[PDB]
Design a protein around this ligand. Structure first.
Ligand SMILES: Nc1ncnc2c1ncn2[C@@H]1O[C@H](COP(=O)(O)OP(=O)(O)OP(=O)(O)O)[C@@H](O)[C@H]1O
Ligand SMILES: Nc1ncnc2c1ncn2[C@@H]1O[C@H](COP(=O)(O)OP(=O)(O)OP(=O)(O)O)[C@@H](O)[C@H]1O
Ligand SMILES: [Mg+2]
Ligand SMILES: [Mg+2]
Lengths: 224, 224
């Protein structure tokens, strides 16, 4: 086939999409699986003054494979407002609604030249991009597999389970992974006991990202 | 009929269930609608040393209507662990799983003596109480109407919409209300524009709790 595509969403902004995407692409590249990182839609940015956005971080990693890449090759709709993409678009670029057909073509074109195309979303599964589409709708149009990153604090059970319910209600292959930060052992005492129970009872277990690089590479690449 | 029952859940722990429950019961009581506040399951508590739990706050309000009430009349399963109720029960009281049939009877008994019975949950809709039941399952067994309180920060769109999807997938009457705190005007600039759009497109709008005491009293009391 052409390259596989993995969408990375999250329980919440700041949960760890970019951290975990970069760690997974680094692992895949070190294993010989040629992997690009894309951030098609990004809010909260000011490219004139700041070179630290998700797309900038992705670009640095990506240029290890292709020096010719530039920011506009990997990120397409960019906004100053710290908001849902739909509202940032309506306010800053009223005449250019986000075109997910166009995004789908652009992203799929990278499956010619990479074994894996990782696509970071923004906001959350239900965050609106157009009047008719949210991030999940975008992921569904892409026909990507889904990696949902969860935070590692109290509340992760509820947040993971809300996302599980939405995702299992749709036709896509997905995996929920907790981004377990350094210095957190409350997790193991408070939340992990339920994750373990849930996993005995579920055909699609919740994993810990840091434990799961090999499993998540396998997941991303499996099948058609 | 007997008294109505309203379950209060939230997008997240600390979103404002207890604050909003107390404000709604105060309003209802001031309108002549005799209203009790119940906290059937509570984690994170130490009653030997602290008289500030949700059940204690509810009890103070409730004793304005019935001096004879005590803590054990309005809260039934109480745990020290700051966790999901299921894990706190398994660790602290292994031989007493939470009995939602029993809770249902206890809570329904208050519909003899009150016009409205407000029931605060814990944790979130998907938080586990028994091996087979979460908070939503409990609310469904109660045949209560549902008030879901959302936080007022960035992320509320995603969180409200995840809960909306779960709730609309079940057979219950529900209302999502944002607990808009004092000193937050970022809300109006960042999140409200989408809430307004959503509400033009939805048959069940997301409201702002502070704007909605009368509407939410009407909601709680309407019909059978
Ligand atoms: N495992 C981790 N260990 C330490 N720091 C982390 C970890 N994961 C995330 N962080 C830090 O938390 C912050 C948020 O992480 P990150 O940018 O990966 O999240 P995000 O989900 O991509 O956010 P956004 O929604 O803005 O795209 C960053 O400063 C990051 O360095
Ligand atoms: N509208 C508000 N204005 C000011 N403070 C608020 C507001 N709502 C909540 N708070 C404060 O935020 C904290 C959490 O609120 P509250 O206890 O109502 O949340 P909760 O959802 O009931 O939490 P829990 O999940 O622990 O039951 C409390 O200290 C409360 O006083
Ligand atoms: Mg990011
Ligand atoms: Mg409370």
């Amino acid at each position: 086939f052409q390259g596989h595509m993995l969408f990375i969403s999250a329980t919440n902004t700041n949960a760890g999409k970019t951290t975990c995407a970069r760690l997974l692409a680094q692992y895949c590249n070190a294993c010989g699986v040629k992997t690009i990182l894309l951030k098609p839609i990004e809010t909260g940015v000011n490219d004139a003054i700041n070179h630290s956005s998700d797309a900038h971080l992705f670009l640095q990693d990506n240029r290890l494979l292709d020096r010719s890449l530039t920011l506009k090759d990997i990120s397409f709709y960019r906004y100053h407002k710290v908001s849902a993409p739909l509202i940032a678009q309506q306010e800053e670029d009223p005449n250019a609604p986000i075109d997910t057909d166009n995004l789908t073509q652009r992203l799929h074109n990278f499956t010619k030249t990479y074994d894996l195309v990782i696509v970071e979303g923004a906001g959350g599964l239900c965050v609106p991009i157009t009047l008719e589409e949210n991030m999940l709708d975008f992921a569904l149009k892409l026909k990507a597999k889904m990696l949902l990153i969860s935070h590692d604090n109290l509340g992760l059970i509820n947040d993971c389970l809300l996302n599980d319910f939405l995702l299992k209600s749709h036709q896509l292959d997905y995996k929920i992974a907790i981004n377990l930060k350094g210095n957190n052992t409350a997790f193991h005492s408070i939340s992990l006991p339920y994750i373990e129970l849930f996993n005995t009872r579920s055909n699609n277990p919740i994993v810990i990202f840091q434990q799961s690089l090999k499993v998540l590479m396998s997941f991303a690449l499996k099948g058609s």
